[PDB]
Design a protein around this ligand. Structure first.
Ligand SMILES: *[C@@H]1O[C@H](CO)[C@@H](O[C@@H]2O[C@H](CO)[C@@H](O)[C@H](O)[C@H]2NC(C)=O)[C@H](O)[C@H]1NC(C)=O
Ligand SMILES: *[C@@H]1O[C@H](CO)[C@@H](O[C@@H]2O[C@H](CO)[C@@H](O)[C@H](O)[C@H]2NC(C)=O)[C@H](O)[C@H]1NC(C)=O
Ligand SMILES: *[C@@H]1O[C@H](CO)[C@@H](O[C@@H]2O[C@H](CO)[C@@H](O)[C@H](O)[C@H]2NC(C)=O)[C@H](O)[C@H]1NC(C)=O
Ligand SMILES: *[C@@H]1O[C@H](CO)[C@@H](O[C@@H]2O[C@H](CO)[C@@H](O)[C@H](O)[C@H]2NC(C)=O)[C@H](O)[C@H]1NC(C)=O
Ligand SMILES: *[C@@H]1O[C@H](CO)[C@@H](O[C@@H]2O[C@H](CO)[C@@H](O)[C@H](O)[C@H]2NC(C)=O)[C@H](O)[C@H]1NC(C)=O
Ligand SMILES: *[C@@H]1O[C@H](CO)[C@@H](O)[C@H](O)[C@H]1NC(C)=O
Ligand SMILES: *[C@@H]1O[C@H](CO)[C@@H](O)[C@H](O)[C@H]1NC(C)=O
Ligand SMILES: *[C@@H]1O[C@H](CO)[C@@H](O)[C@H](O)[C@H]1NC(C)=O
Ligand SMILES: *[C@@H]1O[C@H](CO)[C@@H](O)[C@H](O)[C@H]1NC(C)=O
Ligand SMILES: *[C@@H]1O[C@H](CO)[C@@H](O)[C@H](O)[C@H]1NC(C)=O
Ligand SMILES: *[C@@H]1O[C@H](CO)[C@@H](O)[C@H](O)[C@H]1NC(C)=O
Lengths: 244, 366, 49
C-alpha cells in the first residue's frame, strides 16, 4: 500500500506574528509568588511564525507546533534524519483509543497518511519496519487551540502540550497561557527533520483544510512570575528592547 | 569551659560565649517510587523449550527493573559465574540494555563458555570475547530434555572451515567439504553433514545429561541506562530531626504535615535562594514540610571568679523543650532570647549589671 | 613446579586500616545461607596461592 498522487499538495505558506505564546514550565519545582529569571530555549517574543494552509521541515533545536484544530484532523508526526531504514526514525500516531509511539526504522512512503474508511481501519503510512526498539501506548491527546512543544536534549525527547478554548476567527489570540509538561522519553535519535501526518477521507481523498503554525526556538533568558498557586501568569523577554 | 576558651585562670564578672550545639539526627529514611514493571525473566528461565546451541536464542531486555537477588539466591543453579562484575553488586550498578543467550549443551561443555576458551562449541557454535562482561548460569535439565528413546531434537555444529566471531550465529546447513573433491550438495568420500544430533537419555551419567545455559551480557551504549534492581525503601517518621533521601534528594531536618497545594507534575518545592521547603513522597503522593532542626550557641553568665564559683547557662533562641548535668539544674526559665538555667526569676526591677537581652538581665545576690 | 608458599587474601568482610595485619583463616560466607564453618556453596577459602 504505497501509491503517489497527481494533485501536487502545495499550500500558501504565509508569515504572521508570534505574539507572546510558547511559554512552558522548565522544571518540576514549585514556587509561590516569586519572580525567577531562567536561561533556556524558548520562542522569542513577537517573532515570525510560518502559517501553512506535507512539506519537509528542519527540526533545528526545537519546534513549536500550533493548530486551530476543528474535528481533530491532524493525526501523527514523523521525526528523523534520513526518513528511511538507513537511520533511526520516530513515529507518533493518535487514533480514537490511544496514542502510539514507535522508535524504529520504517520505509516511509512519498505521501504518507493515515487514511480512513467510510469502524475506521486504514494504515498505509510506511511499507516495512524491523529492529523496532522503543514502544509506547497511552491516552489520546485529542474548535480548540492545541499547542505543542517538541525538544530533544541529552538523549531525552520532551513533549509539552496545552489545549485552550478559543473563539477568534483567524490569527493567534493575544493572551498568555503556560505550557505544562506532557511526556518524556529516554531515547537516542539525531532528529533533524520532521513531517506532519494528515487524515484524508478514503472513500477520493478530501483533506485540504489543514492549516497550522510552525515556529523555531532559540536560547535566551526569560523572567517568569509565579503566583501563589505556582502557576505561571506572566513572562518577560530580557533581550527584546531597553525597557525589557 | 570558660577558663579554657578565655585562656586564663581568673574570670571577671560578665557574660561569655563558649561553644555551640545542635540537635543530632536520630535515624535515616529512604523513600522511592512504588516499584513495578519487572523484567520478564520467567519466560526465559522457565520456558517450555530451549533452542539449539548453534541456533542459540537471543533476547533483548530494556526499560524494566531486574531483580538479580532472587536469581543469585536460587539453589537450583549448578553454575553461576559472573566475570565482568561481582554478583553481589549487580543491584547497585546498571547499564542501558541486556542480551540473554539461552541454549542447551552437554555437562562437560559448560566450561567452554568463558573468555579465552577453545572447543567445538567454543569455536563453531558460540564464541565469547575475551573482554566479555556479564554472567553465565547453567543448570540441570535431565528430567525434561532427556528422552528414554533419545532426544534428537538438539543439534550442534562440528565441521566448519573457519571459527566464529564473538556473538555470531551460523545456521547454514551447507555440506562441509573436508577433502579436495567438490560435492554437488551430497555427502561422500570427503563431504559430511556439519550438524550432529545429541543423544541425551535419562540413563546417561553426569557430564552427558542435558544442561540449560543462559548467558547475560550488559551493553554500554551512550543511551541512558534504564535496567537495574529495585530501590530499597522504608517507612517515614515525623516530628523528629532525621536525614532523608527522598528520590535522590538528600537533606537533614524535621518533617511535618503541610497544607501547600502542588500541581500534579511537580515533585518538590522551594521558596528562595535554592532552599528546599516541601517534598512529595513518591509512594503516597503527599505534600510534606521540612524544617531545619534547632541549633544555637551557648553562653555563660558569671559574677566574677573572685566573688563566687556558680554560673548561669543561656541557650540562645532555643525553645525550652529539648535542652539536653545541666538538664534540670535549677528552675528553668524561658526568655525571648532562649532558655536560661541556673538562675531564678523575680518580680522586682533593678538596674542592669550583666545584659542578657529582650529587655531583661541578671545579677548576683544566687 | 611452582612456588605455592606465597598466598594472598582475596575475600574479606571490609577493607584494611593502614598498617593493619590480619591472619585469621576463617571461611567466608559469600551468600545469604550461612556456611557454619563448613566449606560449600557460597563458601570459599579466602587464601589463594
Ligand atoms: C536490522 O539489524 C540487523 C542486525 O544488525 C541488520 O543486519 C545487518 O545488515 C547489514 C546490511 O548491510 C549487514 O552488513 C550485517 O552483516 C547484518 N548483521 C546481522 C547481524 O544480520 C539489518 O540490516 C537491520 N535492518 C535494516 C533494515 O537495516
Ligand atoms: C489559587 O488557589 C486557591 C485555592 O483553591 C483558589 O481559591 C479558590 O478558587 C475557587 C475557584 O474560583 C473558588 O471556588 C474558591 O472559593 C477559592 N477559595 C479561596 C479560599 O479563595 C484560587 O482561585 C486559585 N487561583 C488564584 C489566582 O488565587
Ligand atoms: C521457575 O519456576 C519455579 C517453580 O515454581 C520457581 O521456583 C519457585 O519460585 C517461587 C517464587 O515465587 C518460590 O516461592 C518457590 O519456593 C520456588 N520453588 C522452587 C521449587 O524453586 C522459579 O522462581 C521460576 N523462575 C522464574 C525465573 O520464573
Ligand atoms: C503503591 O503501592 C501500594 C501497595 O499496595 C499502594 O499504596 C496503598 O495501597 C493500599 C492498599 O493497596 C491502599 O489502601 C492505599 O490507598 C494506597 N495508598 C495510596 C496513596 O494510594 C498503591 O497500590 C500504590 N499507591 C501509589 C500512590 O502509587
Ligand atoms: C515550645 O514547643 C512547644 C511544643 O513543641 C510549644 O507548645 C505549643 O504551643 C502552641 C502555641 O503556643 C500550641 O498551639 C501547642 O498546643 C503547644 N503544644 C504543646 C505540646 O505544648 C511552645 O509554645 C514552644 N515554646 C514557645 C516559647 O513557643
Ligand atoms: C515575517 O517576515 C516577512 C518578511 O521577511 C514580513 O513581511 C512579515 O511581516 C513578517 N511577519 C511578522 C513580522 O509577523
Ligand atoms: C488504536 O491503535 C492501537 C495500537 O495501534 C490499537 O490497539 C487500537 O485498537 C486502535 N484503535 C482503533 C479504534 O483502531
Ligand atoms: C477543548 O478543550 C477543552 C478543555 O480540555 C475541552 O473540555 C473541550 O472538550 C475541547 N473541545 C474540543 C472540540 O476539542
Ligand atoms: C548522532 O551523530 C553523532 C555524530 O554524527 C554520533 O556520534 C552519534 O552516535 C549519533 N547518535 C544517534 C542517536 O544517531
Ligand atoms: C579578690 O578580692 C580580695 C578581697 O575582696 C582582694 O584582696 C584580692 O586582691 C582580689 N583579687 C584580685 C586578683 O585582685
Ligand atoms: C510574679 O507575679 C506574678 C503575678 O502576681 C506571679 O504569677 C508570679 O508567680 C510571680 N513570680 C514570682 C517569682 O513570685
Amino acid at each position: 500500500q504505497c501509491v503517489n498522487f497527481t494533485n501536487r499538495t502545495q499550500l500558501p505558506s504565509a508569515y504572521t506574528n508570534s505574539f507572546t505564546r510558547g511559554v512552558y514550565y522548565p522544571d518540576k519545582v514549585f514556587r509561590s509568588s516569586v519572580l525567577h529569571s531562567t536561561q533556556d530555549l524558548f520562542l522569542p517574543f513577537f517573532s515570525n511564525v510560518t502559517w501553512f494552509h506535507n512539506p519537509v521541515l528542519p527540526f533545528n533545536d526545537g519546534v513549536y507546533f500550533a493548530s486551530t484544530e476543528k474535528s481533530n484532523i491532524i493525526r501523527g508526526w514523523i521525526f528523523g534524519t534520513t526518513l528511511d531504514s538507513k537511520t533511526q526514525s520516530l513515529l507518533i500516531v493518535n487514533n480514537a483509543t490511544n496514542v502510539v509511539i514507535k522508535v524504529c526504522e520504517f520505509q516511509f512512503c512519498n505521501y504518507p497518511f493515515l487514511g480512513v474508511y467510510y469502524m475506521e481501519s486504514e494504515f498505509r503510512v510506511y511499507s516495512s519496519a524491523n529492529n523496532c526498539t522503543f514502544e509506547y501506548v497511552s491516552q489520546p491527546f485529542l474548535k480548540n487551540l492545541s499547542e505543542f512543544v517538541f525538544k530533544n536534549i541529552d538523549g531525552y525527547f520532551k513533549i509539552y502540550s496545552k489545549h485552550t478554548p478559543i473563539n477568534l476567527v483567524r490569527d493567534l489570540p493575544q493572551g498568555f497561557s503556560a505550557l505544562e509538561p506532557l511526556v518524556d522519553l529516554p531515547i537516542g535519535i539525531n532528529i533533524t527533520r520532521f513531517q506532519t501526518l494528515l487524515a484524508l477521507h478514503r472513500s477520493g481523498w478530501t483533506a485540504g483544510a489543514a492549516a497550522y503554525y510552525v515556529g523555531y526556538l532559540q536560547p535566551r533568558t526569560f523572567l517568569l512570575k509565579y503566583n501563589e498557586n505556582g502557576t505561571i501568569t506572566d513572562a518577560v523577554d530580557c533581550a527584546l528592547d531597553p525597557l525589557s | 569551659e570558660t577558663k579554657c576558651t578565655l585562656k586564663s585562670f581568673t574570670v571577671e564578672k560578665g557574660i561569655y560565649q563558649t561553644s555551640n550545639f545542635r540537635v543530632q539526627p536520630t535515624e535515616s529514611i529512604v523513600r522511592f517510587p512504588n516499584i513495578t514493571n519487572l523484567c520478564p525473566f520467567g519466560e526465559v528461565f522457565n520456558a517450555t523449550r530451549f533452542a539449539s546451541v548453534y541456533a542459540w536464542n537471543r533476547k533483548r531486555i530494556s526499560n524494566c527493573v531486574a531483580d538479580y537477588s532472587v536469581l543469585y539466591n536460587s539453589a537450583s543453579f549448578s553454575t553461576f559465574k559472573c566475570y565482568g562484575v561481582s554478583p553481589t553488586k549487580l543491584n547497585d550498578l546498571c547499564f542501558t540494555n541486556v542480551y540473554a543467550d539461552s541454549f542447551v549443551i552437554r555437562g562437560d561443555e559448560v566450561r567452554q563458555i568463558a573468555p579465552g576458551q577453545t572447543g567445538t562449541i567454543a569455536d563453531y557454535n558460540y564464541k565469547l570475547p575475551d573482554d566479555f562482561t556479564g554472567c553465565v548460569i547453567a543448570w540441570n535439565s535431565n528430567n525434561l530434555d532427556s528422552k528414554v528413546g533419545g532426544n534428537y531434537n538438539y543439534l550442534y555444529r562440528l565441521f566448519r572451515k573457519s571459527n566464529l566471531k564473538p556473538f555470531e550465529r551460523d545456521i547454514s546447513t551447507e555440506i562441509y567439504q573436508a577433502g579436495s573433491t567438490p560435492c554437488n550438495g551430497v555427502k561422500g568420500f570427503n563431504c559430511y553433514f556439519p550438524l550432529q544430533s545429541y543423544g541425551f537419555q535419562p540413563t546417561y551419567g553426569v557430564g552427558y545429561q542435558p544442561y540449560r545455559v543462559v548467558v547475560l551480557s550488559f551493553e554500554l551504549l551512550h543511551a541512558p541506562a534504564t535496567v537495574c534492581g529495585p530501590k530499597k525503601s522504608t517507612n517515614l517518621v515525623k516530628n523528629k530531626c532525621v536525614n532523608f533521601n527522598f528520590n535522590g534528594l538528600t537533606g537533614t531536618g524535621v518533617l511535618t504535615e503541610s497544607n501547600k497545594k502542588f500541581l500534579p507534575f511537580q515533585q518538590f518545592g522551594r521558596d528562595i535562594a535554592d532552599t528546599t521547603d516541601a517534598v512529595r513522597d513518591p509512594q503516597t503522593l503527599e505534600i510534606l514540610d521540612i524544617t531545619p532542626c534547632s541549633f544555637g550557641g551557648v553562653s555563660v553568665i558569671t559574677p566574677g571568679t573572685n566573688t563566687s564559683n556558680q554560673v548561669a547557662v543561656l541557650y540562645q533562641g532555643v525553645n525550652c523543650t529539648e535542652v539536653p548535668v545541666y538538664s534540670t539544674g535549677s528552675n528553668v526559665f524561658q526568655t525571648r532570647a532562649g532558655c536560661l538555667i541556673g538562675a531564678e526569676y523575680v518580680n522586682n526591677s533593678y538596674e542592669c549589671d550583666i545584659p542578657i537581652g529582650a529587655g531583661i538581665c541578671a545579677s548576683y545576690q544566687s
